[PDB]
Amino acid sequence: AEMEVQIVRNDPPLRYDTNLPVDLLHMVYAGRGATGSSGVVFGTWYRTIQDRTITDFPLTTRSADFRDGRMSKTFMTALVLSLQACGRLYVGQRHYSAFECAVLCLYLLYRNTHGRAPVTFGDLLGRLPRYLACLAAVIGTEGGRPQYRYRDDKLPKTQFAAGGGRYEHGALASHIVIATLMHHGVLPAAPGDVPVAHHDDINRAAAAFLSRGHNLFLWEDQTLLRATANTITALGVIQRLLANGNVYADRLNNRLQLGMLIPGAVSGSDSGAIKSGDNNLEALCANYVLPLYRADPAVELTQLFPGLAALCLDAQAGRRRVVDMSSGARQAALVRLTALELINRTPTPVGEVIHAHDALAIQYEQGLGLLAQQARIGLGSNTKRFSAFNVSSDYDMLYFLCLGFIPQYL
């Protein structure tokens, strides 16, 4: 059972074994331009992370090949796995993913505000764009400062998860997404703070669309609620980044050239207008997100879109010696988890790994909030920004989001 997905309408589907970016890396490094007077590069951002990884965790040199100042395949593999791990929930017994919860919440919000009726979870995934547009309209772009952040003063400092299923009272309540879901009857009122659930529409929808016979009371599993609000926030950002994208622009303006990367393995269709709506997103949901979800219903947003994680991390600043504002220092969390991934490939206390993973999840969340707050995060208004990630076209953006990088033979 091989996986097959389609990232962009004009391109051929992509068939592979288990993890798309990892498999693609195997292909680009087994190819021509990956040796001799030619090498595989991924952009300045990735160069900075690799340099920083070598400097701060020298032992990684014993697990990867950094000769000729080239970009290491083992390094990029560990890095993509870390990006994919950003939004993963390892600790905690649960029967639903943050992604499934996010889909059910968006569905309910749409039903409660806006509104052929969806019958399966699959139906819901297909209609994600309209739910996302609804969320966007409901939130608004006025009032000034939609707050996509929690009350950090009320949340743990070095752990992501809520110890016993609950964070300090009011820790989550103020995030715009959560306040919106409560305002519109999707999420019940928060538990009180003073010494089965027929009124929980989310649990009900979960029962109906997934029928797993397990209760889903988000206020009782607040780690999952926090992850759910983050996933919703991330989907809104993806929708924004892909809005009105022209994936048919001049092919020669794409940093990504599948033809050069995998030599050989490679109109009149009223696809739509150039100033597309959420058409590309619509297609992604149907031909990328859905097939991946069915193959693995526990999958989370960052696993689907490691590129989104990278953009989010790049947006945050990190957590008489030195005031380091360098990209490398800002990504210290990413670097550490990546280095740990690398070094273990050669038995790091699971607790140390959990600590490193939690610190990254925390910075991802912080960066995601900053990105969600920005008025203009589109490719146009951030050309140099995306350039550091080897993205220059809307075509590139789509692949970047799913892969976590854009390879090019240099």
Q: Which residue has tokens 């991802």?
A: 364
Task: Classify residue 211 as left (phi > 0), alpha (psi -120 to 50) or beta.
Answer: left
Tokens encoding 199 = 């009124």
Which residue from 399, 69, 395 is spatially nearest to 254, judged by alpha carbons?
395
Measure the CA dihedral 138/141/143/144, to 10°.
140
Residue 66: Cβ-neighbour burial (10 angstroms; 0-12, 13-18, 19+): middle
Question: What distances in angstroms separate CA 206 from CA 97, 130, 212, one per listed residue?
Answer: 11, 20, 8
Question: What distances in angstroms separate CA 356 from CA 229, 260, 351, 362, one per listed residue?
Answer: 22, 37, 9, 10
CA distance 109 to 182: 10
How many domains would you assign to the chain?
1
Where in the sequence is the domain holding 55, given as residue range(s)? 1-410
Do the beta carbons of residue 41 and residue 71 sit within 8 Å? yes
Instruction: Give the resolution to one decimal, in Å.
Output: 2.1
Return the HEC string of 265-279. CCCCCCCCCCCCCCH
Contacts of 319 (CB under 8 A, 6+ apart): 332, 333, 359, 362, 363
CA distance 129 to 139: 15
Up-side HSE of residue 329: CA atoms within 13 Å toward CB? 7
Residue 19: Cβ-neighbour burial (10 angstroms; 0-12, 13-18, 19+): middle
CA distance 328 to 384: 18
First to last CA, the chain: 34
Contacts of 333 (CB under 8 A, 6+ apart): 313, 318, 319, 356, 359, 360, 362, 363
Q: Which helix (H) or strand (E) holds 47?
A: helix 44-56
CA distance 399 to 397: 6
Q: Which residue has tokens 């966007």?
A: 136
Q: Helix-strand-coil percent breakdown of the chain, rounded to 5?
A: 55, 0, 45
Residue 192: Cβ-neighbour burial (10 angstroms; 0-12, 13-18, 19+): exposed
Which residue from 147, 111, 107 is spatially nearest to 127, judged by alpha carbons?
107
Contacts of 240 (CB under 8 A, 6+ apart): 136, 377, 378
